[PDB]
Write a protein that binds this ligand. Sequence first.
Ligand SMILES: [Mg+2]
Ligand SMILES: [Mg+2]
Ligand SMILES: [Mg+2]
Ligand SMILES: [Mg+2]
Ligand SMILES: [Mg+2]
Ligand SMILES: [Mg+2]
Ligand SMILES: [Mg+2]
Ligand SMILES: [Mg+2]
Ligand SMILES: [Mg+2]
Ligand SMILES: [Mg+2]
Ligand SMILES: [Mg+2]
Ligand SMILES: [Mg+2]
Ligand SMILES: [Mg+2]
Ligand SMILES: [Mg+2]
Ligand SMILES: [Zn+2]
Ligand SMILES: [Zn+2]
Lengths: 136, 131, 150, 87, 386, 61
Amino acid sequence: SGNGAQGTKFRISLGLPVGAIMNCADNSGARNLYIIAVKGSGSRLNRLPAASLGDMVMATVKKGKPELRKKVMPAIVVRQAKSWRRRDGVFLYFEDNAGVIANPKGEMKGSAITGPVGKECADLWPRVASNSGVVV
Amino acid sequence: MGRYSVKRYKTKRRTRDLDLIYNDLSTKESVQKLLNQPLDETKPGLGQHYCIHCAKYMETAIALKTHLKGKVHKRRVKELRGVPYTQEVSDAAAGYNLNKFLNRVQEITQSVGPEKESNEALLKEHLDSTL
Amino acid sequence: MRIYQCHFCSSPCYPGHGIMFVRNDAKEFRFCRSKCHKAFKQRRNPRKLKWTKAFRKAAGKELAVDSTLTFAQRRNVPVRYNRELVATTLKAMARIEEIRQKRERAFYKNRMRGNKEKDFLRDKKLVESNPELLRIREVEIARKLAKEQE
Amino acid sequence: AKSLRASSHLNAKSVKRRGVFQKAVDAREQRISDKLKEDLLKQKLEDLKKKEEQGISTSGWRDGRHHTYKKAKLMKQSKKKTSFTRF
Amino acid sequence: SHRKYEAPRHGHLGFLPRKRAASIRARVKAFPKDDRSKPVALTSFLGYKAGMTTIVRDLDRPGSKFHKREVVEAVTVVDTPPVVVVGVVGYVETPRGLRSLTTVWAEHLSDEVKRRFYKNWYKSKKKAFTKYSAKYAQDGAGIERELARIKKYASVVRVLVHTQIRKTPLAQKKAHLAEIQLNGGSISEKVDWAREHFEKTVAVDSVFEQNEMIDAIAVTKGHGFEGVTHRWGTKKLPRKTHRGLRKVACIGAWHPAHVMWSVARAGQRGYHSRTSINHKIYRVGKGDDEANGATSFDRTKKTITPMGGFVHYGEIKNDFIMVKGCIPGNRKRIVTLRKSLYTNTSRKALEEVSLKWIDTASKFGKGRFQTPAEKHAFMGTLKKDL
Amino acid sequence: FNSSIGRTAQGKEFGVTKARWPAKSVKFVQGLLQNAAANAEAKGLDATKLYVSHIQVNQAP
RNA sequence: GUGAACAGCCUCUAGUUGAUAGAAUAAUGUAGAUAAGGGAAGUCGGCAAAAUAGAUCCGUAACUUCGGGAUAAGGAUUGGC
RNA sequence: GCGUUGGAUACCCACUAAUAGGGAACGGCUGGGUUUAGACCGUCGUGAGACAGGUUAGUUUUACCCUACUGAUGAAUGUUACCGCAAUAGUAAUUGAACUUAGUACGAGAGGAACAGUUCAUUCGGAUAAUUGGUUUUUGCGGCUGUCUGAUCAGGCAUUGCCGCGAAGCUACCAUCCGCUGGAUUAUGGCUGAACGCCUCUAAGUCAGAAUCCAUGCUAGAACGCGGUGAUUUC
RNA sequence: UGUACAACGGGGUAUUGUAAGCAGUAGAGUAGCGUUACGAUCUGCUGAGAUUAAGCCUUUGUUGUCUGAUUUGU
Ligand SMILES: [Mg+2]
Ligand SMILES: [Mg+2]
Ligand SMILES: [Mg+2]
Ligand SMILES: [Mg+2]
Ligand SMILES: [Mg+2]
Ligand SMILES: [Mg+2]
Ligand SMILES: [Mg+2]
Ligand SMILES: [Mg+2]
Ligand SMILES: [Mg+2]
Ligand SMILES: [Mg+2]
Ligand SMILES: [Mg+2]
Ligand SMILES: [Mg+2]
Ligand SMILES: [Mg+2]
Ligand SMILES: [Mg+2]
Ligand SMILES: [Zn+2]
Ligand SMILES: [Zn+2]
């Protein structure tokens, strides 16, 4: 479930395969993130690794500070546009896909997160929960 | 379901909501902030020439003027005339939070509405003067 | 476990049914149906769509302001559990539903008064306007009755 | 990982199985058996009330039909040479 | 030479052949191991799949992230009116296997079960078991001798029961007959139990109870002749490949000069026998309970039947079993419910289910209302009602 | 002469699965049967006791 | 009639109604379509599809044989009364 | 037994429990290649032409035969019907993490486990359709353009005309559920004990022990394997 | 020859979205003498109207139907 994650993670519908671009929801200067790998991904012939909300990915910055560019860094997915089932009994989705830059322990590089953060990701990652202003 | 509706109103191609635009127009400070924006490289027209009603950037002032002279803009202006339809309306139509909805309607009719109307009048005459 | 009302048509949203959309300002839009969700995405006006409760209240098809419609509201200040208070609330809910249904019926009855008068005037004008068809009807009546007689 | 057929996991499972899980199974068995007996008794009472309204050697053959059938079959198998155990 | 990238094979070689099942009633292939000191008990039951609905469960599961939280789950409803005991079969052990030694029937059978013995019931003189029933006269010799034979020789005792299909909404009048093993006391006590229960009914709550794991045995839904892509789950070939893309491109590139049995081929899909295990009984509903669709949290007086009835089935008017999840077979198919072959050591087999709510909205559309009173109360006064 | 013919339930009376309904053949054979009956009546034979004792099909040019 | 139009679509005069049929609706095809989230990760290669499209107005770079490039690109719009 | 990847152009990047080597060719579609006729550049040749070479364009089109394989019927051994047995054949599950054990054993420190008890997920497999999503000839309801039926009405045509919604059915790791436990063993660790007056796990005998083997469980049921049981004909 | 079967009808349950017709003093205005005439549209009667098993559920109604062929013995 990733190093720095808090506990187990139940299955969520996948929305971000490799090659997707999500927004950057933190304040570290990045504008978007390009997914190149997914942590904890399984292996199966022809199957693209994909990420859901609360997953850790390896991402590059395509738009933003040149200091942030040309570097591959961990990011944590805090919003997705693909609908997913909550166990309380509703399917739900956000407007956009969004992630935040972290280190391998899952600590936030930036100081705040703009916009809502999915409850599943916030509950999985304590530092995201500490930097979140809106938890859905 | 059909291709036209799917590719126009796909979630990744969503537009700003009408209650949010109503709140944008209600206060003078929001109006001035949206009228006078910093030079942003990634918006059309360097972030200038922004129509608040349609939440839309135009490339040029002449484009904004031709847009204001249009049935599309007038359609949006007509849409923003009434109560902005929060979840409170649906709750009250179900018969729930009725007093809250009635208080909100009274506040719109007494304070928030006429102030929004005055701001819209001032905004329209400023656009007429500068365009 | 809570019953929600649809953001579009105010219909009840039971657990598992419908879909929720979260906007970037943390506002949840719960929809009971794909029909209502697709209407919201196409940005149609619920106050103009005739099959919604928002329209029906706006146009006065059903009574919107009544003393029975004020008992149900989101309670943000909790009260400690009391068994007899729960029992009294449960009895009151059925009583309030009964009274609200009676007042709804009366409201529809008052809205539909005049219907019989309109129908009678329309029937009278049609009967006054068709003398030839009535003559045909009388001939048919007389022949059928003479057939029964003989 | 340990397979489903892993010895140490199956040993731990058997130790767990002899206790609280078997206790639950046995208690459910007793409850169900009592319900079954009450169901039979209730049927007897209903039938009794309704009728109130109205008012060993196992040697040899099973029957004569069985005697004739098996004798004819064995004679036929002898005649057609189709016996599994006899010539 | 070697395959360059590894992949697991497509499909399961232990579910072969993928042929149509020989019967619409799937066989019970194994019963639980008999414990002689235990009281007498049936090992299985017969029901009809009626449909699915949705529940809310107040979950108690220590160590789980959903501990002390509500979960929304799918359930399956099986219509189970009581079965009627009509016979007993004795089985002996032989070096060639188990052999049925003798069968004893009850004196009187209903036309419901007599129809199972006919292809053309309406034309027949209905003569089945008429001479047999005359063997119950003059102190019942023959019957007593065959029961004595069962007691003297049988190592296994099974009981012949049948469904009361006339209590279901089904158009079929011909009942389903099956053998159900008796696990319990001695052979003599098993036989005495069967003889006492001849022509009597056994209800599902005298076989199962709530919070118990059971197994569902049924024939799956048929789908006719199927291509490889959907029958086996193989990858589609590229667009406009000559002679089709719903194929396996090469069915053999190697020496045996035959097609291997392990190669995917087009054929029958569905209508196979399946035995799925460890389905938890969420509710044992009684047919005369007016609120058997209601819980301690939902105070609405309602039954289990959804508005308009179950689609293609009808209404539930008998005892029913609600198990979580899904079971093989389509609605109105006959299913066999089996007791567990082993003592389950998972804690889910120990959990006590507490339902908060049962969904009774209409399944014939996007049902928004749980009761017709609720629908009428929400909509208001209609034009015809005045 | 039945290679790759369809299967029908009306073959069960004769213990086969492959059976057909050849209308042209049946009409030609019915014509010849009616002629044979006419000839027997002209000879004075009892029509209730008549059975088909020989029937043969050969290939024409 | 629509429309710039011998376009496409519908109609009047005139002319046809010909081409083995019936019943069923498995797989695989041939011809045509739609698809959540992602958006070339597919492939030798964006092959194939999709996207664009009429008209009115605003606006239009390098380069150039000064004639072009040009419908460059990029924008605003379009019903009925 | 069980897996052994996603890309980029044999090497890298990453993910991963791991990204092991090899055979059935090298004793079905398809891209480079034998690539025939067109063409250009280079080297050689007096030349026709050839090549140290380089580049570009270039039609070969079964299956209805037998068999194998996947599924599907079916004669006959009194007839017809219901419930069963099980020879044989196949067989299936896998991997990672988490809580507790614990900040414990161990350690100057820095660090830091496991068994027993619990909870999820990966890959695979079998089902399933309550819900969400996709799909629409339900041509079910409504609308739109053009034209035609004098208008209204109700309709036709536009190779399913087009747009919105759309039940039912089908269906998706795009949805949900479910997937076990007895015997015998390998390496190895032993017991008793000779050979050999010491000794020795081995010679005779014997105890444990691997995701292994044989079973339990699961799929088919021999159309020439079998059992139990019901009825058995009035022109 | 009967909780018989079927064709219709009734009631539910779903889908769409307010039918035809008549009216108004609602309607940018324009023409003629506050009035009349045209006028996209709007409002009311009207969650109306249409559809609803073809693989939905149900049924105290109406009307009908219940009939031929072939073969099998220890
Ligand atoms: Mg691949
Ligand atoms: Mg449904
Ligand atoms: Mg053929
Ligand atoms: Mg798509
Ligand atoms: Mg590529
Ligand atoms: Mg590739
Ligand atoms: Mg150019
Ligand atoms: Mg050449
Ligand atoms: Mg075997
Ligand atoms: Mg452990
Ligand atoms: Mg599947
Ligand atoms: Mg038209
Ligand atoms: Mg020793
Ligand atoms: Mg057999
Ligand atoms: Zn605007
Ligand atoms: Zn709704």
